[PDB]
């Protein structure tokens, strides 16, 4: 069933995040971080004395590039997974899918480890297009910790409308400039990325110096840590990856569905507990992107 | 004249860091509970990667280190076959001297220990000036430091585990003080008097 | 602080009883506030911790059912008996308190 | 009193003593021996102090004479032979087998102290067997599981508490169960 070429091209365009520090006279001053060999290279980065707040701040933005895929061998398919799209969209919509990557934005699922310790932290965004204020959350701690505390934001059903227009409607798109701040205690551990090879961090020079930085695609790995969104439910820390082949819940034994779950979507109400989660997952799955050839 | 005896850690699995670490600390607390501080210590043998399998403590007087080597943890671990002690062996002629000199730089070079520093030139600013801004302080973009081991201690009076660094040196000969700091050290705060090893 | 206990008590009735009288206002809150204690103390068990009352007990945890049993000792310690009355699986097939297999455990089976 | 053991071993009466079933006195005594005479009363009346003593003791003396090191240290080295000794007795009830009772009562209570030393010391694949009663087949099948998470058919790749935690929530039986102890 799987054409000799089929690719898509992700809809989530996560950016690197750049680390500030904020003084008391409120001047910032990008991050910086000391590297320690032996005569083997340790790397260290901590807050320095003085600092009032870190903040960090980075650019996502959200399109509509799932609706066709972006090469396609044999025209069946094309049309099968573009129906496919579209009954997915007009039966079950494109709010828990936008929910959930909203919240993971929103939360401070992105600064991973770098949130365990802060007294405090706030997330504030300005979308593009926007006509008002900036949206704003304060002291995600402990104001919002929940889908119900995110959705008693003054306007949280207007930010998450645009990315279900961005999503649904060809050309549509959505972009978000977030603005973390970080209140961490006196000579905190922060924790960037890690560069592929001890511990040394990935850097990029920001304003004629070096800088820490947490990779654009480590940030796009928590912006869509949904279910993390994969071919299989592969798990970082313990090695073992769930939806096995074996268990017949992969992205390939559930894309070769694709006829099945188009009768299913058309012809009467679909089950919450197996075809709804199945069409999350390859929804999911065709956000991302990736080639499915073979 | 100086009077040696030395101890071998005979288990093959073992941190010797860990070994020597608790042999300076009983060390130490002899060069409390009496006031003497005669004794240093001394490692035969140093290798870049870990201190050596034997350490020798070295005295001008013999009484006062076969006493100290009679403290209660030695005597409870040579019966356990985990330490093997030599009585005592006149210092050769042959031998060489070096100094362990600890080293409190590194303290300071570590981030934490910036920020000490930092905090310390706040506080002494008390002295009358204009107040300086941290934000001109910053910490250098590469540091490179000798080989170094960083045995490991724990304070006693506050339960604060600060580790001490020794960093092995070669020095003149002579030197007749014979005195020492809580620990041997090589680097009393009055003079760096070397040990043999 | 621990409510009144009873051995008929179960595990999903003893956290509604908990969370009911240590002031939080309702359930699905509580188990929240749960999962970031044990992230605040650097528990390794935080991620597996349950978030609804349905499949709490330790018997529906999959493969983390030892990180759900550690972070229910560790809340315990720090003291009443969360453990016995939790429903754990046994390679002999349910185990609860010392018999293998307001609401009564009696109730579930 | 060197006398009542001969009336205490009979299993009648012997009010200083937890009365077991006599199979379980002769273990008892079989324990007693390595660690036959009126020492033997005196342990059982203040039975609980006197018992969390010994642990103290011993533990303290592995701790303070320990050897390797502060951390990384092994269960033998700190607790093997207390351990590894009393667990192997007849049947292995928990309520019946009181040392053990009690052992897993002070390693429960003590667990995640100071740096959690007793809850981080690592462990073999043959004493994890060993106190589990489990099969190395099915210790292959769980760490394949991921349910054993390594940090080899003998190697030091787990730790007390994970398997401890792992027992009390996969490994209880009718007899060789918590609340029997609690």
């Known amino acids: 069933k799987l054409p000799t070429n089929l690719a898509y091209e992700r809809s989530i365009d996560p950016s690197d995040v750049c680390f500030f520090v904020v003084w008391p006279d409120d001047r910032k001053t990008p991050l910086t971080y000391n590297s320690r060999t032996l005569l083997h290279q340790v790397d260290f980065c901590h807050v320095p004395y003085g600092a009032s707040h870190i903040e960090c701040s980075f650019s996502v933005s959200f399109s509509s590039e799932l609706r066709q895929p972006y090469k396609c061998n044999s025209s069946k398919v094309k049309q099968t997974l573009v129906q496919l799209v579209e009954l997915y969209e007009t039966k079950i919509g494109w709010t828990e899918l936008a929910t959930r990557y909203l919240m993971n934005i929103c939360n401070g699922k992105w600064l991973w480890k770098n949130t365990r310790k802060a007294y405090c932290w706030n997330i504030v965004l300005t979308p593009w297009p926007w006509n008002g204020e900036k949206v704003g959350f304060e002291d995600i701690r402990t104001n919002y910790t929940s889908r119900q505390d995110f959705k008693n934001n003054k306007n949280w059903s207007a930010i998450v409308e645009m990315i279900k227009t961005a999503f649904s409607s060809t050309d549509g798109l959505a972009i978000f400039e977030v603005r973390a701040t970080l209140h961490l205690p006196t000579n905190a551990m922060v924790r960037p990325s890690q560069v592929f090879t001890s511990r040394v961090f990935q850097s990029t020079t920001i304003d004629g110096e070096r800088s820490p930085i947490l990779g654009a695609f480590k940030t796009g790995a928590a912006i869509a840590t949904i279910d993390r969104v994969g071919r299989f439910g592969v798990h970082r820390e313990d090695v073992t990856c769930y939806r096995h082949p074996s268990t017949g819940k992969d992205f390939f034994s559930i894309l070769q569905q694709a006829e099945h779950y188009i009768e299913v979507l058309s012809a009467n109400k679909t089950p919450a507990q197996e075809t709804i989660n199945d069409m999350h997952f390859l929804m999911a799955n065709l956000i991302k992107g990736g080639m499915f050839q073979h | 004249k100086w009077y040696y005896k030395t101890i071998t850690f005979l288990p093959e699995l073992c941190n010797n860091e860990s070994l020597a670490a608790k042999c300076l600390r009983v060390l130490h607390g002899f060069n409390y509970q009496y006031e003497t501080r005669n004794i240093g210590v001394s490692f035969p043998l140093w290798c870049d990667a870990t201190v050596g399998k034997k350490i020798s403590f070295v005295s001008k007087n013999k009484i006062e280190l076969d006493l100290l080597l009679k403290q209660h943890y030695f005597v409870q671990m040579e019966q356990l076959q985990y330490f093997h002690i030599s009585n005592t062996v006149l210092v050769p002629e042959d031998c060489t001297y070096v100094s362990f000199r600890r080293c409190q730089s590194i303290d300071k070079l570590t981030a934490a220990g910036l920020a000490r520093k930092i905090r310390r030139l706040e506080k002494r600013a008390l002295s009358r000036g204009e107040q300086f801004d941290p934000s001109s302080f910053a910490q250098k973009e590469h540091t490179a430091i000798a080989h170094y081991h960083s045995l490991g201690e724990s304070s006693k009076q506050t339960n604060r585990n600060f580790r001490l660094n020794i960093r092995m040196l070669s020095e003149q000969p002579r030197e007749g003080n014979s005195i020492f700091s809580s620990y041997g050290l090589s680097n009393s705060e009055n003079s760096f008097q070397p040990v043999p090893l | ?109 | 009193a060197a006398c009542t053991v001969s009336n205490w071993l009979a299993g009648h009466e012997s009010k200083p003593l937890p009365n077991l079933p006599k199979s379980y006195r002769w273990g008892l005594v079989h324990w007693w021996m390595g660690i036959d005479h009126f020492s033997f009363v005196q342990f059982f009346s203040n039975w609980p102090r006197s018992f969390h003593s010994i642990i103290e003791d011993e533990v303290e003396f592995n701790l303070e004479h320990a050897v390797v090191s502060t951390s990384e240290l092994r269960l033998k080295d700190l607790l093997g032979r207390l351990f590894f000794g009393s667990i192997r007795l007849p049947e292995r009830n928990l309520q019946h087998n009181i040392i053990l009772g009690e052992l897993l009562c002070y390693l429960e209570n003590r667990l995640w102290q100071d740096k959690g030393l007793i809850a981080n010391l690592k462990m073999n694949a043959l004493e994890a067997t060993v106190m589990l009663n489990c099969s190395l087949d099915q210790i292959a099948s769980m760490v394949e599981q991921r349910i054993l998470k390594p940090n080899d058919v003998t190697d030091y790749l787990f730790h007390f508490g994970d398997i401890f935690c792992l027992w009390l929530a996969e490994f209880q039986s009718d007899e060789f169960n918590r609340s029997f102890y609690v």
Do not use: C, W
């Open chain 3, 1 to 109: 602080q621990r409510p009144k206990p009873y051995s008929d008590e179960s595990l999903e009735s003893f956290f509604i009883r908990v969370a009911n009288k240590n002031g939080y206002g309702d359930v699905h809150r509580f188990l929240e506030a749960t999962k970031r204690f044990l992230q605040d103390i650097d528990h390794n068990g935080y991620q597996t911790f349950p978030t609804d009352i349905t499949r709490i007990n330790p018997y529906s945890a999959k493969n983390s059912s030892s990180a759900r049993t550690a972070s229910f000792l560790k809340l315990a310690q720090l003291p009443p008996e969360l453990l016995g009355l939790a429903i754990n699986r046994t390679n002999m097939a349910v185990v609860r308190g010392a018999e293998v297999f307001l609401r009564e455990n009696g109730y579930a089976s």
